[PDB]
Design a protein around this ligand. Structure first.
Ligand code: 45T
Ligand code: 45T
Ligand code: MG
Lengths: 211, 210
């Protein structure tokens, strides 16, 4: 239960802390985690009874269920999705969905090599124009041809989509503005904030120097 | 708040009613781990609050600059196991008001302006110490930072056979193989909210390749 207000200077405050960069709040921490917990229940319901090719015992030719021996493959997209993935896989643990996480950069390579015929779920933190995920779903499809490939996003910005891509799973929806907080950044700043805000346009270019 | 630890009808470890058949014992529950990290967030905040390092945000200011949103503390997390530890930790550092940024290394960085900066490595385990001794020596050589300290989630000082000691330690464990909360056996059990001693029978349970 977070309390959103304004300080004496007119800056947005969440639970008494001032966020001078924020214009408004998109979702407080309680809203974000309430969404991810229901999302984990949704994913678990969508994947628990499924079957895919057994990479555990290479000698078995029948298709195996999703267990700790043949878990769900989760591809987290660096950089901003690591906080989202961290909370998410623990929620999937609560719903008892066995899973494994490998990371990719948008480019640093995957290290998993047994994706063919496997159920695969990519976890990105935002879809805006839809380009980044359209290229990623096409690349993974042709390099590995999994059994299923689906996208779960923390934040969908539908109003700014240019290509035609939809995430199968969406935690939050956001307005067509630049957001920061909880993985979203401005030159890596505000990534560790526990809520998602709309950034003041005056702050969009405040840290131009390269890290 | 505190997690309840017991045993089920078959002697398996239970935490809050959920059974963990691969576990031998519980090193630390989620609440113990989070109380520790929250106290480390205070400790790190007191250590870096008043420091100063090179001003890269305004390269025309030859004077040193405090740790701000313009020149934050550089934090290097190592992948993969330490990403969950890092995710919780940076948020705790947010509550303690310590401005920081995180880039990841695996054993490739993308940050390059580390010289004259305060840098802190986030790792989940220090046992023999070889992996961390190699990293600090290589970063001091290729970056010449102002300071370079190490914060680890679990320290196993009975296992060290090489000269290295982390300046910041959340938990101290015996010389045993742990799984849970970042720690794994062939990428399993990473997402469990607690840290368990692994049964030696489960050590070679998933030999196949991912
Ligand atoms: N911080 C922030 N970044 C945004 C946003 N929208 C797009 N981006 C850029 C981008 C966010 O990823 C860059 C941040 P990174 O994870 O640290 O590399 O989203 C891709 C949009 P696409 O699906 O049209 O390809 C936003 O609202 N806030
Ligand atoms: N799961 C698990 N792995 C352990 C453990 N100890 C060392 N390792 C291996 C290792 C960490 O494993 C790396 C695997 P990743 O983090 O998933 O990429 O730690 C080396 C410590 P040292 O070089 O200072 O001696 C342990 O207790 N549990
Ligand atoms: Mg490790």
């Amino acid at each position: 239960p977070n309390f959103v207000g304004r300080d004496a200077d007119g800056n947005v405050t969440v639970d008494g802390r001032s966020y001078p960069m924020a214009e408004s709040v998109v979702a407080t921490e309680s809203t974000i985690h309430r969404s991810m917990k229901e999302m984990a229940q949704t994913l678990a319901n969508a994947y628990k009874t499924l079957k895919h090719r057994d990479t555990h015992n290479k000698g078995n030719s029948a298709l195996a269920p999703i267990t700790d021996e043949n878990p769900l493959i989760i591809i987290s997209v660096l950089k901003g999705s690591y906080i989202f993935t961290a909370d998410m896989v623990r929620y999937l643990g609560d719903c008892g969905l066995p899973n494994v996480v490998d990371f990719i950069r948008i480019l640093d390579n995957l290290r998993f090599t047994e994706l063919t015929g496997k159920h695969v779920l990519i976890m990105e933190d935002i879809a805006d124009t839809g380009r980044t995920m359209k290229l990623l779903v096409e690349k993974i499809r042709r390099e590995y041809r999994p059994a299923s490939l689906k996208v779960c996003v923390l934040v969908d910005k539908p109003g700014g989509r240019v290509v035609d891509f939809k995430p199968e799973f969406v935690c939050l929806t956001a307005p067509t503005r630049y957001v920061v907080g909880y993985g979203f950044e401005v030159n890596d700043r505000y990534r560790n904030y526990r809520h998602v805000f709309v950034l003041k346009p005056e702050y969009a270019k405040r840290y131009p120097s390269k890290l």
